[PDB]
């Protein structure tokens, strides 16, 4: 399935903002519960444990899928970390959130899984669907009158979408040239320690 509990709870527990614009997190940068404020022993295993947990929770990926992405990255001729970041970035919900059409990643998943998008002209409602090179994404014409959709399109002034992504016109047609690179990705968190966690 997918996570259902409050996102702010886990964001505050991790100590790092996940959405970024939260207001209830920064005022409590400590973990929750009775003994969240207590100091904890410093062990690396724990460190990359929250690293992996926040990496796989900022998207919505469950444990099994994230593991599968890890083995997919490892077998590639390139470096494991960059491959894993690219594979996580290739998903549709990731793209629609990164294309400025969604304010929340969970909203992006709930929107892409409702059949409001068409990739290469064929209807797709798969949050885990992976895009490829030279790909074109459109929105079904019946949904252009949808109130949240027009709310999203009228506010096209948020943080600009990466170079590979292009929302070219008033029709909100998404063009992707090539898979994002590491510096192109510009996503926080450490990545080699995840390889260390899964390489024991």
């Amino acid at each position: 399935a997918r996570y259902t509990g409050p996102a702010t709870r886990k964001s505050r527990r991790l100590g790092v903002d996940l959405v970024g614009g939260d207001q209830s997190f920064e005022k409590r940068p400590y973990p929750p519960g009775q003994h969240g404020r207590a100091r904890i022993k410093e062990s690396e295993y724990r460190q990359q444990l929250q690293e992996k947990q926040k990496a796989r929770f900022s998207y919505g990926v469950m444990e099994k899928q994230f593991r599968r992405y890890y083995e997919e990255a490892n077998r590639q001729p390139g470096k494991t970390g960059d491959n894993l970041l690219r594979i996580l970035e290739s998903r549709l919900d990731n793209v629609v959130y990164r294309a400025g059409l969604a304010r929340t990643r969970r909203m992006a998943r709930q929107l892409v899984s409702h059949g409001h998008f068409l990739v290469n002209g064929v209807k797709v409602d798969i949050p885990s669907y992976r895009v490829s090179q030279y790909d074109i994404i459109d929105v079904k014409e019946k949904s252009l009158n949808t109130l949240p959709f027009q709310i999203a399109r009228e506010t096209a002034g948020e943080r600009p979408i990466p170079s590979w992504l292009q929302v070219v016109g008033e029709r909100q047609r998404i063009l992707v040239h090539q898979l994002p690179e590491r510096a192109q990705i510009d996503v926080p968190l450490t990545e080699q320690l995840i390889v260390e966690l899964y390489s024991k």
Binding site: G78, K79, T80, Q192, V195, E196, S199
Partner: protein, 180 residues
């Protein structure tokens, strides 16, 4: 801005007619992450003094690790005390594959790609000594070529020379980029 690693803290005891006398011993590794290691053993009456003495005595013993880019030159086998440790170079992106004490020593050394395996006497101090012996047993192509009195292209294989060449090419690029 060094790298400090505490791998073992051990409480030792002496017997006197009154009772027991307790002391603490710490094994510490200090390195810069660029190819400099030092191993220190400190004895004191409590943990922080032991750690400080170990660090200070480690800094008095540094050694050079002959690594080409991100990994050692060639496989080596090291025996010290009763510990035996095997080191083998890897390919980029592999990561560090070693047990506790060896992992600490290699992480402090700055090597990022290595295959290490301990082959007996799992005691931390002896394992560390074996790892240090294995590292000291390494050789670098320049002095090998000098010793045999031949041009380096006649001694080293092609792949090692190519990896070295791209290594200093990347180093020069990094120096240029960090200059401005």
């Amino acid at each position: 801005n060094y790298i400090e690693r505490v791998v073992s803290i051990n409480r030792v005891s002496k017997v006197v007619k009154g009772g027991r006398r307790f002391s603490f011993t710490a094994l510490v590794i200090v390195g810069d992450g660029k190819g400099m290691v030092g191993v220190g053993y400190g004895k004191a009456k409590e943990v922080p003094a032991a750690i400080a003495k170990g660090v200070e005595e480690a800094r008095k013993n540094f050694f050079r690790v002959p690594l080409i880019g991100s990994t050692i030159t060639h496989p080596v086998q090291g025996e010290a005390a009763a510990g035996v440790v095997m080191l083998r170079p890897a390919s980029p992106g592999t990561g560090v594959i070693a047990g506790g004490a060896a992992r600490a020593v290699l992480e402090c050394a700055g090597v990022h790609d290595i295959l290490a395996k301990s082959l007996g006497s799992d005691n931390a101090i002896n394992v560390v000594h074996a790892t240090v012996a294995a590292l000291k047993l390494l050789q670098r192509p320049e002095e090998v070529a000098a010793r045999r009195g031949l041009p380096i292209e006649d001694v080293a294989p092609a792949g090692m020379l190519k990896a070295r060449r791209e290594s200093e090419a990347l180093a020069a690029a990094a120096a240029r980029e960090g200059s401005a």
